[PDB]
Amino acid sequence: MKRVLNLGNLSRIVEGDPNEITDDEILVIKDKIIEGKIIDIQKRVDGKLVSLITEKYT
Amino acid sequence: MKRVLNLGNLSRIVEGDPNEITDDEILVIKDKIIEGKIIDIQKRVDGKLVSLITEKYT
């Protein structure tokens, strides 16, 4: 057990508009219908804002 | 575009044992199949680990 990233790279975990998320920062999309849950973690790669969570099916 | 949470609560995002993380820590799990993905993010609710990301269905 140890920390996952230096706090410098964790201070750039933000909550905002997908259109203003550049690199050197990760995006979190909070859920509305559910209070504490999250919807997706996102990271831009080539202008597109892709997810870091692998899709899981039945 | 504020940080999703403060640093005292982001500092406690860690990587490792699911058994050793307290209620104050968020657990990350790096996907082993893919090289830069995530498979789950967990924090202790009632002594049990539960995914923060909302479950998706079709």
Place this chain on the structure above:
Amino acid sequence: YNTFSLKLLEDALYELSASKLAMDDRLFVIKTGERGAIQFHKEVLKTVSG
């Protein structure tokens, strides 16, 4: 020991110290090779990392 742990070491030394030594005279000094000092360093770092 099979695997080294600051847990195991801290317990043994304290139990010894409680039974045998005053609070003021529990300064211990271990003798090792360079590798034991490294193994110590790694474990100490693993803890503060927790």
